[PDB]
Each structure stands twice: as structure tokens, then as C-alpha cells.
Amino acid sequence: AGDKGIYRHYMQKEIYEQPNAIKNTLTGRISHGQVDLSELGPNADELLSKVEHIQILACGTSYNSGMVSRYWFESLAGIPCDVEIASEFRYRKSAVRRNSLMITLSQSGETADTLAGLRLSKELGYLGSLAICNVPGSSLVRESDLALMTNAGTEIGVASTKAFTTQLTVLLMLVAKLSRLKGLDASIEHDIVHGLQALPSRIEQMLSQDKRIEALAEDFSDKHHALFLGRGDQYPIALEGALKLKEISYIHAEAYAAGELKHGPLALIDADMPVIVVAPNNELLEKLKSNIEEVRARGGQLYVFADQDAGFVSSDNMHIIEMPHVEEVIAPIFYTVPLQLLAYHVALIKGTDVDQPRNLAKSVTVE
Template identity: 75%
Template sequence: MTRAGTEIGVASTKAFTTQLAAMLMMVVSIARLQGRMTAEREAEIVKSLHELPANIEKALAFDKEIEALATDFADKHHTLFLGRGEYYPIAMEASLKLKEISYIHAEAYAAGELKHGPLALIDADMPVVVVAPTNDLLEKLKSNIEEVRARGGLLYVFADEKAGFEGDENMKIIQMPHVDDIIAPIYYTVPMQLLSYHVALIKGTDVDQPRNLAKAVTVE
């Protein structure tokens, strides 16, 4: 139903992004049937979905930059991913991919919960990857980032170009072109998956057939 075609690799990538697109279409359909969405808003979302392939191409254009970043992760044993609101599940997808194909222990946290445990783990040996679009939670997310910086953490921020971030030796910024909020979670998934891919290649692990994993689950 997602029309993604066959995905041979065990660690799903396009199946994840196409499921997000399919769920968005389902939500729009339900909202329309229930009279909860104006025709104008529906047209805006449909337009954004039509623009999604071109925006995915923009995200893929960061491949070389992400490949360079991946060298910083190859010798690490742990990585923390942070996202707020609807970007927390995107952070979870990112952490899943990194652990699946590079065998680096990775965890995702809702950035607002940083002080409830994960902050104790921050040091120069644990990279912290942040998904930072421009939305109404951006200022709170910036506060979380400052907490990590204050404790000597190494930050890798995938940020909207309009978010106003400035990098330094402890914080690398990957400035992403601005896209419509409704499709942004799908868009930000792609560079996260690319990061895991390149880390795995550097480490020499099997990207398509990770150890101990199988495409079909045959036991409960």
C-alpha cells in the first residue's frame, strides 16, 4: 500500500518514510470526511506532498557532508539522539538505524526529558545528534542544546536554515533548506538514515544484512 517497492535491506529506510506519507494521507482523508479540514488546508497539504520528492532530493544532496561527519562516530560506543514533539519519533528512528547497522549503542530521548537522566551521560565521548526544525518548540530545543554544550558535549545539529544556529568546535551545524512543517518529519528522516549508513560503511559492517537480525520475524 505504500508503493515503496521491494526493500531488500533488513534495516528499513524507504518503507519508514513512505509509511509516514501514507499515514499523512490517511489523516487528511479522515479529517475531510469528518468535516474537520478546510479545502484550502487540504490543498496545501497535497501540494506539500507533491513537493516531497524534490525536497527528499535536497536532503540527499547533503550526502557528502554527512559522510564527512560520520568519521566522528566510527570510534564511538554510544550516541544520543534528541528531538521535540513530532521529531522525537524521528530521533527514535535515527537511533534505531545507527544501532542496527553500525552496532553502536544509541538511544533517543524527547529533548524536554533531558534533565531526567540522559544529561548525566553527557561527556566528550558521547555524540549528541539533534533534529532542529523551525517550529514553536525551537527556543525550548535551543535551551536543551545549551545544556549539552555547558557540559562539554559534542553536538551535531540538523537544523532548518532559518533556525539561526551558529556552529563552533563542539557543535557542528548541518543547515537544511526550509520545508513545510507538515512534511518536515519525513524530510529530516533522510539525513538521519544517511548518517547511520555512512558510519556503518566506515566501520565495515554489513549495511543490508546486520548481524542477528532477519527480515521476517518467525518467533514471538
């Protein structure tokens, strides 16, 4: 499988390779401050400029990356985007949108549900298909019209880390390139390229503070439940942080849109169910603190990952886990890191099988 070097597990290694991985993914693609996707060929732009809707299919952690990207495609490139679990798409009769581009996200490029949604799509009237993948020569790559490799290097750990952040990096580059094809304000693209060029050092910063996440992991290591909350583009990061905690600690962690906490889940919260919040602004955190106060009688606690610049202050049931300020455009990618490290340190404390969590496999090559 490969040399782990100084890391104890492939996953830890892959988490620490994120900066170099994202660097590698940017290589050849940034030319004079603009996204250069010329690796796609001379007719690529013709197709891309035709796109009026983007459809994304994937499973697991790859669906979570697609979900983040939808907020980018719509808010920044102004393009309608839908993301769907691959198995759900493949078994339903769908209404295909005018001039829709079909994108599949997959680390392995072999996931059966995703490969099937792609095969099916060819007969449904899509403008064409684009594979974002980390494995060259894999089926999803071979069978798509276009492919943008993430170039993260091989990922051996079953719970994906660098493949996810490099996927979001390729996605943001596509959003950039599409904002330009649509003749949208050039600042949209520059903000993205700048967020991207900073990203590697911003994660390297996040990594240097791993010891603080380790301490936090002690408060979750004996818990059997956890609720992860996020709003907008951080909603999917909360999805991804609960998936990672499920995957390698086996804790029953579920994600929720922050605004729906009150429409149900507050009834479950007690001391055995910590609530994590991913990069909330002030207005949202005020609501959440008011919600957690409703459950103080049961020891409800909020754990808030947030920009030190927001000025939030920890209280007895609200713990601010301060992070460096970072560019809004890349914040979803950056806030993933602490959630990967949290899951990893909980797994270490418990002594679970990080690189091969029970009953899971790197890629599900069967439907």
C-alpha cells in the same frame, strides 16, 4: 534478491529510491488536489467517518512511523490516536475505545507480533481494521478489512528506509482524508497534498548533499554511544535515527524526548557520547545549548540538524548541520533521510554488514 544497479548495497539503493518510491505511493491517490482513497471501495468512507479514535500497532521501524503519525492525527485531524508496540498490546488486557479504528503498519505484512495484535483485535470490538503494508497478498493485508499498499517496491535491506518513508506518506494521506470527512478546514488537506507533492524533490535535494553527511559520519564512527533528541513529531524521527544507528553500526544509540535530557541522561554525556538534535526551533535549541554547556567539562557536543532559515550558528560544542527549508507538515519524513544516510556512512566506514546486520532478519515471523 534483485539488481543493485550502481549502488553498493540494497539499503543505499533503497535510500536513493525514496523520491521515486514516494512518487509511486502518491500515484492514483491525488485527484484534483485532494486525497483519493477510492481504492478502498464504496463503504470505506462510511466506516472512516465513524472513527473517533485510532489505534496503531506495529514493531521496530513500523512503530516509529506510527508514532510520528499520532502527532499528525491529533494536531491536524483532531482525532485521538494511540500507538503501541505490537507485543505489548497482544499480551495485555486493554480498554478498547469507542469507535476505534485499528491500524497495523508493517513492511512485510507477516510480523508475528503485529499479526497477533490484529487477530486479537477482531474479538475486542474495534470498528474495523486497516493494513498499511508494502507486501501484497501478505497475511496482514489478507486479514484486515482494508489495506493501503505503500508501493515502494521490494525492500531487501534489513534496516528499512523507503518502507518507512512511504508508510509515513500513506499515513499523512489518511490524516488528510480524515480531516475532510470530519468537515475540517480544507486548508489542512491542501497543505498536506502540497507538502506531499514537493516531498520527492525535497528528498532528491537532501540526497545531493550526501557528501556532507559522509563527513559527519567520520565524527561518529569511533563512538560507542549516541543520544538522539527530538521534540513532538521529530521525537519519533530521533527514535528512528537511533534505531538505524543501532542496527547497522552497532553503536549504542538511544533516543530521548528533547525535554527529558535534563531529567537524567545529561549525567551520561561525555566525548564518547555525541548528542544529535533533530530539527529543533530556537526556543528548544537555546535550552539544549544551555544543557550541553553544563557538560562542557567532559567534552559534551551537540550535532544539530536544522533549517538553514533558523539562523543557528555553530560553536565549538554545537555543530549546525544545515538543511534546506521544507514544509512543516512533511518535515518528519524529510529529516529521516539525513539520519538514514548518517547510519549508512558510519556502517560503510566501519565495514559492517549493512544489508544483513549481525543477528537481525528482515521480518520476525515468530513471536
